[PDB]
Design a protein around this ligand. Structure first.
Ligand SMILES: O=c1cc(O)n([C@@H]2O[C@H](COP(=O)(O)O)[C@@H](O)[C@H]2O)c(=O)[nH]1
Ligand SMILES: O=c1cc(O)n([C@@H]2O[C@H](COP(=O)(O)O)[C@@H](O)[C@H]2O)c(=O)[nH]1
Lengths: 257, 257
């Protein structure tokens, strides 16, 4: 009884951020999230403008931007609104609730002011979600819980993954899905976003492992592929993004029937 | 066959950063780490200057400082050198190796340029340590692995904790100890630093749980207490720091015999 992204956008328990995302995925025929892993604001913004039509989401690591300013994020928001994609800051919050609330709202980055989505590790227990929610609920934001990781020797397996799923399902007012390698929740209101994706087999020299869009979306049942170097290191990043988009989209359609 | 901090500083396999720390702990009769959880640079620096003589370490969350600049960290280093304490940035790195290396070296914060110590979660597998090491070894830095957490519902238990200890013991050129609630390694070259510490029983409203210095150092065998609000929210932060210092030090001495 698998539903399209557009039908999932209308589910009774859908979060507004998830709904917005699912609708634009359906409209634009994309379930690709660009991992914009660059150190220069100009490159970030040039990528966001050129690839915006091809992506449902742009994932940032703001803490690697050498020339971060809040005005850069204002410019990114303009592009996100123009091309219709969400902004996801991959901060992987992983401390006690009292601390992560400050890390989310404050400091130099003011992440909550510009990020539609953030993510959190579940290792601290559910206080990490409660802390983030105190800032994110008033700001109408969503959160993803890291249920599995793509890297060699990941401990996010077995009962750890099951604990992530329970924590999500128990904080559905704020948690809209997962970072995972596969479908981990049976509830269709939750999004599954999967990093560690390339067309070719391989990995990197620091524990990253790759699987293909057909494997991740088609066989493992995830929703969205997150792709960094597969696109960013390519000469023509637009064509690379289109190849990943078409791969992930067709894998999704075939799983739908 | 328990050894003093000063003797542990001389162990054959001791890391240089651990040795420096252990020597100043012995010299100053302090095993207190101040968790300087403030949002203003002026308050951070006033705390570091006044409390510097009472502490072996000052722990930062640079990402909650509203007015962070690299010049603030230069001023903090001057104080750390004057009063003899290490600087520990509690960044809790928790991503793939390729990403954390950039988060450690680069961006606005340039953490590796000023932090003696950082910490990492073990959930991504050992690539998190390998990535950090590529930056930290050339810069003569050390790392702490998060083996246990103080918060309600922590998943850093059982085999997860055992995996943290193995990962530390296998990367002893860079990893100098743990964030933990107790002694988790039997090897005396490793430091144990414990947050979730207050004199009085209690917790916070976002999953923090407190135990006393006597419990953590004396009964659970940890080395250093990490104390934030117990000191920071007190009217007289200097006297508060002295109370925590004397508590942790005497608990240590009594465990020594
Ligand atoms: O399990 C995970 C969780 C992540 O955040 N990531 C992130 O997703 C991206 C993967 O990038 P790449 O496609 O270049 O390997 C990185 O930004 C990394 O930080 C991951 O690779 N695996
Ligand atoms: O398990 C852990 C790991 C932490 O980093 N911390 C950190 O240690 C400090 C505890 O501060 P406090 O004493 O105010 O509760 C915080 O900065 C928090 O981020 C913790 O409390 N428990």
């Amino acid at each position: 009884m698998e539903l399209s992204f557009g039908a999932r956008a209308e589910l009774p328990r859908i979060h507004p951020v998830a709904s917005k995302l699912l609708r634009l995925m359906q409209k634009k025929e994309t379930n690709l999230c660009l991992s914009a892993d660059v150190s220069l604001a100009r490159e970030l913004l040039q990528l966001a403008d050129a690839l915006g039509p091809s992506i449902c989401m742009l994932k940032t690591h703001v803490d690697i931007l050498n020339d971060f300013t809040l005005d850069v994020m204002k410019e990114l928001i303009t592009l996100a609104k123009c091309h219709e994609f969400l902004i996801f800051e991959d901060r992987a919050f992983a401390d006690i609730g009292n601390t992560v609330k400050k890390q989310y709202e404050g400091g130099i980055f003011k992440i909550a002011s510009w990020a539609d989505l953030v993510n959190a590790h579940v290792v601290p227990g559910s206080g990490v979600v409660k802390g983030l929610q105190e800032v994110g609920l008033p700001l109408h934001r969503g959160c993803l819980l890291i249920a599995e990781m793509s890297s060699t020797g990941s401990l996010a397996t077995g009962d750890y993954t099951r604990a992530a799923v329970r924590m999500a399902e128990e904080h559905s007012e704020f948690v809209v899905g997962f970072i995972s390698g596969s479908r981990v929740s049976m509830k269709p209101e939750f999004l599954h976003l999967t990093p560690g994706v390339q067309l070719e087999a391989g990995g990197d020299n620091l524990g990253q492992q790759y699987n293909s869009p057909q494997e991740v979306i088609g066989k493992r049942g995830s929703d969205i592929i997150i792709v960094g170097r597969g696109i960013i290191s390519a000469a023509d990043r637009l064509e690379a993004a289109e190849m990943y988009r078409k791969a992930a989209w067709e894998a999704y359609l075939s799983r739908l029937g």
